[PDB]
Amino acid sequence: VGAPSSPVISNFCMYEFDNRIHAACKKVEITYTRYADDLTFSSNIPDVLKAVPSTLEVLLKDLFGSALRLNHSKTVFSSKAHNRHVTGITINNEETLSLGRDRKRFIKHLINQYKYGLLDNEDKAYLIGLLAFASHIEPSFITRMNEKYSLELMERLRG
DNA sequence: GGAAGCGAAAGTGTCGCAACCCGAGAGAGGAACGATCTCGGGTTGCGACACTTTCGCAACCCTTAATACGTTC
């Protein structure tokens, strides 16, 4: 994982895998993406995702034999009844990308601390970094923070 | 992958007990030996458990890394 060439080589080695599974999923109206070793499948049709794990095992055996295997402990089904996240990003029930309630509450906590000059420099730097990420995933959250905390405070923070 | 120490799992050998067999011996019945019962020593089968052997957890991070803050693998 630590080598600069490893990302490229790993993506290449998964090329044929991705081709086959993507095509197969598209026929049954399943969305498929891969982030390195993390595979994600989603659908609006009930009772279609149950077949996917078996399909995966067969394909892996076909392409790689016993070299690459599913982590069966890490196979998880979810729905709008439950928490859904993809690579650290929460998908809320309004179908919008979110940081999640707990992370948002934590950020608000840090901003409140800053407002009263209680954040140390390390925490301040941390807060600034996290807000940049928040701006990328959920820009509306930043707008809300501006409304809640004065634009002036927030600008002062981000300056 | 697998140090060093440790113990799980599983197979093998030991060993002490119980049940049995055998001959020896004192001497009931009544008056001639020797009935019945117990001593002492040996054998054999059984099974609980001690002993033996193998496996596998995961220290270390190899000379060889970078340093603005966050996120993901």
Side-chain angles (χ1 to χ4, degrees):
Chain A
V1 72
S5 55
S6 291
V8 174
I9 302 310
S10 60
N11 276 344
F12 166 65
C13 289
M14 288 301 291
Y15 177 86
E16 186 56 39
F17 176 91
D18 291 333
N19 226 290
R20 294 251 259 279
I21 202 74
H22 183 80
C25 283
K26 196 173 183 186
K27 293 188 284 171
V28 193
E29 300 289 78
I30 295 169
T31 302
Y32 162 79
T33 59
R34 180 174 63 78
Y35 198 95
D37 55 316
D38 162 297
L39 308 167
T40 310
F41 306 84
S42 66
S43 183
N44 285 315
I45 298 166
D47 298 295
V48 294
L49 294 177
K50 295 146 69 153
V52 170
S54 56
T55 303
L56 291 174
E57 284 180 54
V58 167
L59 186 58
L60 285 167
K61 203 179 101 167
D62 171 304
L63 292 171
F64 307 110
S66 61
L68 278 155
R69 304 187 76 100
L70 276 181
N71 204 135
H72 289 113
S73 91
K74 301 287 261 188
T75 299
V76 177
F77 289 81
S78 190
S79 75
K80 289 180 51 267
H82 316 282
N83 172 265
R84 298 172 296 155
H85 61 276
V86 177
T87 49
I89 299 172
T90 300
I91 304 168
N92 68 11
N93 292 340
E94 295 185 299
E95 310 184 4
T96 305
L97 304 180
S98 164
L99 298 159
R101 193 189 233 245
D102 290 329
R103 209 206 288 274
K104 287 185 268 208
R105 283 176 73 89
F106 180 47
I107 293 167
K108 286 190 295 177
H109 168 78
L110 291 176
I111 297 167
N112 186 267
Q113 290 291 99
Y114 173 73
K115 181 175 173 272
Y116 300 118
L118 297 171
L119 275 194
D120 67 21
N121 294 317
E122 195 184 357
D123 288 339
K124 187 178 180 171
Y126 173 72
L127 173 56
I128 291 167
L130 199 55
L131 285 170
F133 176 72
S135 82
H136 187 53
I137 304 304
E138 194 180 2
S140 61
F141 174 74
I142 303 296
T143 303
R144 287 194 297 261
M145 292 305 93
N146 288 336
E147 202 304 307
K148 185 176 159 89
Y149 288 105
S150 123
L151 187 74
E152 301 85 74
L153 180 73
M154 289 294 284
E155 284 177 315
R156 193 159 68 69
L157 177 60
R158 281 139 82 67

Coordinates of all heavy atoms in Angstrom, one line a residue, chain A residues 35 37 87 126 133, chain B residues 69-73:
Chain A
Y35 N -14.0 1.6 -4.3 CA -13.0 2.5 -3.8 C -11.9 1.6 -3.2 O -12.0 1.2 -2.0 CB -13.6 3.4 -2.8 CG -12.7 4.6 -2.5 CD1 -12.9 5.8 -3.1 CD2 -11.7 4.5 -1.5 CE1 -12.0 6.9 -2.9 CE2 -10.8 5.6 -1.3 CZ -11.0 6.8 -2.0 OH -10.2 7.8 -1.7
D37 N -10.3 -1.4 -2.0 CA -10.7 -2.8 -1.6 C -12.2 -2.7 -1.2 O -12.7 -3.8 -0.8 CB -9.9 -3.3 -0.5 CG -9.7 -2.5 0.7 OD1 -9.6 -1.3 0.6 OD2 -9.8 -3.1 1.9
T87 N -17.8 5.3 2.3 CA -16.4 5.9 2.4 C -16.4 7.1 3.3 O -15.9 8.1 3.0 CB -15.8 6.2 1.1 OG1 -16.7 6.9 0.2 CG2 -15.3 4.9 0.4
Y126 N -6.9 22.1 13.5 CA -7.8 20.9 13.2 C -9.1 21.4 12.7 O -9.6 20.8 11.7 CB -7.8 20.0 14.5 CG -8.8 18.9 14.4 CD1 -8.6 17.8 13.5 CD2 -10.1 18.9 15.0 CE1 -9.5 16.8 13.4 CE2 -11.0 17.9 14.9 CZ -10.7 16.9 14.1 OH -11.6 15.8 13.9
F133 N -13.0 20.3 4.5 CA -13.7 19.1 4.1 C -15.2 19.2 4.2 O -15.8 18.8 3.2 CB -13.1 18.0 5.1 CG -13.8 16.6 4.9 CD1 -13.5 15.9 3.7 CD2 -14.7 16.1 5.8 CE1 -14.1 14.7 3.5 CE2 -15.3 14.9 5.6 CZ -15.0 14.2 4.4
Chain B
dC69 P 0.6 19.6 9.7 OP1 0.9 19.3 11.1 OP2 0.8 18.5 8.7 O5' -0.9 19.9 9.6 C5' -1.6 20.9 10.5 C4' -3.0 21.1 10.0 O4' -3.0 21.6 8.7 C3' -3.9 19.9 9.9 O3' -4.4 19.4 11.1 C2' -5.0 20.4 9.0 C1' -4.2 21.2 8.0 N1 -3.8 20.6 6.7 C2 -4.8 20.5 5.7 O2 -5.9 21.1 5.9 N3 -4.5 20.0 4.5 C4 -3.2 19.4 4.3 N4 -3.0 18.8 3.2 C5 -2.3 19.4 5.4 C6 -2.6 20.0 6.5
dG70 P -4.9 17.9 11.3 OP1 -5.1 17.7 12.8 OP2 -4.2 16.9 10.5 O5' -6.4 18.1 10.6 C5' -7.1 17.0 10.2 C4' -8.2 17.4 9.3 O4' -7.7 18.2 8.2 C3' -8.8 16.2 8.5 O3' -9.8 15.6 9.4 C2' -9.4 16.8 7.3 C1' -8.3 17.8 7.0 N9 -7.2 17.4 6.0 C8 -5.9 17.3 6.3 N7 -5.2 16.9 5.3 C5 -6.1 16.7 4.3 C6 -6.0 16.2 2.9 O6 -4.9 15.9 2.4 N1 -7.2 16.1 2.3 C2 -8.4 16.4 2.8 N2 -9.5 16.3 2.0 N3 -8.6 16.9 4.1 C4 -7.4 17.0 4.7
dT71 P -9.6 14.0 9.7 OP1 -10.5 13.7 10.9 OP2 -8.2 13.5 9.8 O5' -10.2 13.5 8.3 C5' -11.6 13.7 8.0 C4' -11.9 13.3 6.6 O4' -11.1 14.0 5.6 C3' -11.6 11.8 6.2 O3' -12.7 11.0 6.5 C2' -11.5 11.9 4.7 C1' -10.9 13.3 4.5 N1 -9.4 13.2 4.2 C2 -8.9 12.8 3.0 O2 -9.7 12.5 2.1 N3 -7.6 12.7 2.9 C4 -6.6 13.0 3.8 O4 -5.4 12.9 3.6 C5 -7.2 13.4 5.1 C7 -6.2 13.7 6.2 C6 -8.5 13.4 5.3
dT72 P -12.4 9.5 7.1 OP1 -13.6 8.8 7.6 OP2 -11.2 9.6 7.9 O5' -12.1 8.7 5.7 C5' -13.2 8.6 4.7 C4' -12.6 7.9 3.5 O4' -11.7 8.8 2.9 C3' -11.8 6.6 3.7 O3' -12.7 5.5 3.7 C2' -11.0 6.6 2.4 C1' -10.7 8.1 2.2 N1 -9.4 8.6 2.7 C2 -8.3 8.5 1.7 O2 -8.5 8.1 0.6 N3 -7.1 8.9 2.2 C4 -6.8 9.4 3.5 O4 -5.7 9.7 3.8 C5 -8.0 9.4 4.4 C7 -7.8 9.9 5.8 C6 -9.2 9.0 3.9
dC73 P -12.2 4.1 4.4 OP1 -13.3 3.2 4.4 OP2 -11.4 4.3 5.6 O5' -11.1 3.6 3.3 C5' -11.5 2.8 2.2 C4' -10.2 2.4 1.4 O4' -9.5 3.5 1.0 C3' -9.3 1.5 2.2 O3' -9.8 0.2 2.3 C2' -8.0 1.7 1.4 C1' -8.1 3.2 1.0 N1 -7.3 4.1 1.9 C2 -6.1 4.6 1.5 O2 -5.6 4.2 0.4 N3 -5.4 5.5 2.3 C4 -5.9 5.9 3.4 N4 -5.2 6.7 4.2 C5 -7.2 5.4 3.9 C6 -7.8 4.5 3.1

